[PDB]
Amino acid sequence: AALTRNPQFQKLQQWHREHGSELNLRHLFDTDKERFNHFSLTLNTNHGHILLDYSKNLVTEEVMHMLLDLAKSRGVEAARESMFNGEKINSTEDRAVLHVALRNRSNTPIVVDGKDVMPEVNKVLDKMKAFCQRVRSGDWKGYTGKTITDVINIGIGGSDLGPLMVTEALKPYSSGGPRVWFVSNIDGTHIAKTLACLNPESSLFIIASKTFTTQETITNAKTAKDWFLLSAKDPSTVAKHFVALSTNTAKVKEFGIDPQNMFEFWDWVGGRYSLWSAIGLSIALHVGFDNFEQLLSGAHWMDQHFRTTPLEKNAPVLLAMLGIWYINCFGCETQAVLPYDQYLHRFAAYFQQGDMESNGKYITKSGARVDHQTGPIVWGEPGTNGQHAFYQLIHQGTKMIPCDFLIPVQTQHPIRKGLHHKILLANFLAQTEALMKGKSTEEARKELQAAGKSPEDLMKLLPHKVFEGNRPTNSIVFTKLTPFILGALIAMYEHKIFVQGVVWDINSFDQWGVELGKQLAKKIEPELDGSSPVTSHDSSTNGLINFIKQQREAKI
C-alpha cells in the first residue's frame, strides 16, 4: 500500500505513461556521445576493477533522477543503516538481518540486544580454519587411519545452493583440496548416485542445516550414516566422518555428532544468505581458508561501497531502481542473468533463490496487501550457449526482458593464446549491441536485395529478418573471477535485492510461503502406504494418489 501512495512513485509512473514508449536506445546513443560516460560506473576494489555499464537501459538523466528521488523517499538509506546496526528489521520473525557481520572483517562492533556479535563470528571462523587445516593436511584421519579425499555436503536450499555455486565458480582455486560433493534432493537418486562413487574410509560428511530438522536433509543424513555404518560397522566412528553446521546443539548431538564438531551460525543469518558463515565450510575445505577469507573480503568491500556511496553512484541501488523501473513501470515479469563464464553455470540458479525467495512476497511490513508487482522471476544460462537456445525469444519474441550480462576480462584458461576468450568477449559485446541496435526494415531490405531475392521471395522473408531492438541490458565486466571479486558480485546483488524490498515495503528476509506445502505433505505421507484408495482430498489429489498406488507395482 505504501509504494502506490508515494508521490515520487506516482510522478515516476505518470511520466512513464506519457513518455515511456518514446524512449529508444538507438536514438539515445545517436544523440549523446557521453551516454556511456554518464550512465556507467567503474569500481576499483584494489583487487580488480568492476565496470557496471547501465547505459543500454531505457532511461534518461531525468528518469534516473526520479528513480533516485523514489529510493530516497522510500527510506532506503535509513533502512540500510538499520540492517548494518543489528536492528530487528526481519519484523515477522523479530530477528536481525546480519549476513554483513559474517564478513565484517573490519570487526567494527555490531550489537544485537546487548552484545557485539563479532567475537562469536570470528570464533566460528577460527574453528573452521583450524578444522580445514586438520582435514586438508591429513591430520584428520578416518576410522582406519586414512586421509580424507572426499567431502560431501548434505543440505538443501540455503544450506546447499551457495556452497555449490561458489565451489563451482572457484574450481581453479581448489588445488590441494579434497573433492567436494553436494547432496540436496530428497530424491533417492541424488544420495544413491553420489555414494556409489565414494570410499566410506576417506569420505567426510557435512550435515548442513540451520534448524537441523529439515526432512530432506535429516533423511539424507540418516541414509548416509547407514551407508557408512554398513562398511565401518561401529557407531562410535561416525564422530570421525560426520560434522554439523547448525544453530541447534541438541539435535546435532542427538544425531550422533559431538558439539565440538558443530560449527554454528545464528538466527540473524538467513539460509539464502548463509554461505558466508559456517555454511561455507565446504567452500573453505575446497579452496582453502585464505581464499575463503578473500571471498568474505570481497563481500565486505561491496558492503562498504553500498553503505558509504551516494545513491547516484551506488551500484546496488542503481541496479535495484533500474529493476523497479522495468518491474513496476514497464511490467516485465522476469530478470535474466547471463554470465559468459562456464564456472558461473550455477550463478543464475543461486539468485533465483536469493531473489525470488526474498522478494516473492505480497504482504507489506504494515500487514497490508500490495497493489503492485514485487519480486520478478529470475532465470538464465551461461554465455555463448544461451545464444543458441533462447536468445531467439529475447531478440524477436513478444516479451520485454531486462538482461544482466556478466563476464571476466581475464580467463582462468587462456588456451590457444586467448583465442577462445577473445571470441567469448566478442559475443558478449555483440549481443548487447544487437539487442540495443536491432536492424530496421530498410536495412534488412537492402541486405535481401543484395542477395538476389525475387520480389516475391524478398517480401515473404523480409519481416522475419527485422530486429526491432530497443531491448535493454546491463553489462557487468570485471578484471577476473577471483574469490574476492566473486564475493563482491554476490554481495552486490544481495543489496540490490535488499533495496527493492525496502522500496516495496516487504520483508525480504522471511519465507512463510513454504509452510503450507510442508503441512500438506506430512498429511499425505501416511496415506500413501497400502493399496486402499484415498478420498480425503479434492478429486485431483485423490486421483493422483490412487494412480500412484495402482502403478506402484505395475511391471513394465
Q: Is 210 annotated as a binding residue?
A: yes
Q: Of 211, 449, 519, 536, which one interacts with ligand S6P (CB under 6 A)?
A: 211
Nearest residue to ligand S6P by CB is 157
Residue 271 near ligand S6P by CB under 6 A: yes
Residue 272 near ligand S6P by CB under 6 A: yes
Q: What residues between 519 and 548 interact with a second copy by CB under 8 A?
A: 519-525, 528-529, 537-545, 547-548
Q: How far is CA 479 from each of CA 47, 294, 427, 484, rounded to the nearest angstrom?
A: 9, 15, 17, 11
Residue 455 near a second copy by CB under 8 A: no
Residue 189 near a second copy by CB under 8 A: yes
Residue 388 near ligand S6P by CB under 6 A: yes
Q: Is 209 annotated as a binding residue?
A: yes
Q: Per this entry, what is the length of the chain?
A: 556
Tell me the catalytic residues. Answer: 357, 388, 518
Which DSSP letter does residue 554 get?
-
Identity of residue 148 = I
Q: Of 156, 169, 191, 403, which one interacts with ligand S6P (CB under 6 A)?
A: 156
Burial of residue 312 (number of CB atoms within 10 Å: 0-12, 13-18, 19+): exposed
* Residue where the block lists cell 534516473: 64
At its nearest, how many Å lie between ligand S6P and the CB of residue 52? 26
Query: What number of chain residues touch ligand S6P (CB under 6 A)?
Result: 16
Helices (H), ranges, 98-255: 99-102, 118-136, 161-169, 188-196, 215-232, 238-241, 249-255
Residue 159 near ligand S6P by CB under 6 A: yes
Q: Measured at the alpha carbon of residue 155, what is the angle toward residues 152 and 159, in degrees to the nearest 5?
A: 110
CA atoms within 13 A on the CB side of 210: 18
Q: How far is CA 56 from each of CA 25, 157, 335, 380, rounded to the nearest angstrom?
A: 7, 34, 15, 19
Which DSSP letter does residue 553 get?
T
Cell numbers describing residue 441: 526494415
The one of ligand S6P, a second copy, none whose footprint includes residue 421, by CB under 5 to 8 A per kind, is a second copy
Q: What residues between 376 and 415 interact with a second copy by CB under 8 A?
A: 376-379, 381-385, 387-399, 401, 409-415
At its nearest, how many Å lie between a second copy and the CB of residue 192? 4
Are the beta carbons of 465 and 447 closer than 8 angstroms?
yes
The one of ligand S6P, a second copy, none whose footprint includes residue 106, by CB under 5 to 8 A per kind, is none
At its nearest, how many Å lie between a second copy and the CB of residue 85? 22
Contact region for ligand S6P (CB under 6 A) — 140-148, 150-158, 181-189, 395-403?
150-158
Q: Of 184, 209, 274, 314, which one interacts with a second copy (CB under 8 A)?
A: 184
Q: Is 298 annotated as a binding residue?
A: no
Q: Which is nearer to ligand S6P, 157 or 380 (CB)?
A: 157
Q: What residues between 46 and 105 interact with a second copy by CB under 8 A?
A: 47-49, 51, 53, 55-56, 91-92
Contact region for a second copy (CB under 8 A) — 121-129, 155-163, 242-250, 279-287?
155-163
Q: Which of 162, 144, 143, 163 is nearest to 152 (CA)?
A: 163
Q: Of 372, 445, 448, 458, which one interacts with a second copy (CB under 8 A)?
A: 372
The one of ligand S6P, a second copy, none whose footprint includes residue 210, by CB under 5 to 8 A per kind, is ligand S6P
Task: Report the distance separating Cα 97 and Cα 90, nearest Å.
Answer: 6
Q: Is 158 annotated as a binding residue?
A: yes
At its nearest, how many Å lie between ligand S6P and the CB of residue 311? 27
Cell numbers describing residue 149: 579425499
Cell numbers describing residue 14: 505518470
Cell numbers describing residue 329: 513501470
Contact region for ligand S6P (CB under 6 A) — 178-186, 269-277, 393-401, 445-453?
269-277
Q: Which is nearer to ligand S6P, 194 or 209 (CB)?
A: 209
Which DSSP letter does residue 329 get?
I
Residue 448 near a second copy by CB under 8 A: no
Contact region for a second copy (CB under 8 A) — 76-84, 106-114, 208-216, 312-320?
208-216
Q: Is 388 annotated as a binding residue?
A: yes
Task: Report the distance separating Cα 224 and Cα 396, nearest Å.
Answer: 49
Can you state the percent helix, strand and coil of the chain, rounding each to 5? 55, 15, 30
CB neighbours of residue 413 within 10 Å: 11
At its nearest, how many Å lie between a second copy and the CB of residue 45? 10
DSSP reduced 3-state for 211: coil
Q: Is 159 annotated as a binding residue?
A: yes
Terminal C-alpha separation, the chain: 56
Residue 270 near ligand S6P by CB under 6 A: yes
- Dihedrals φ, ψ of 402, to 5°? -60, 135
Q: Is 357 annotated as a binding residue?
A: yes
Q: What residues between 338 and 367 interact with ligand S6P by CB under 6 A?
A: 357
DSSP reduced 3-state for 317: helix
Query: Which chain residues interact with ligand S6P by CB under 6 A?
Result: 155-159, 209-211, 214, 217, 270-272, 357, 388, 511
Q: Indicate the annotated binding residues for D-glucose 6-phosphate.
A: 158-159, 209-214, 353, 357, 388, 518
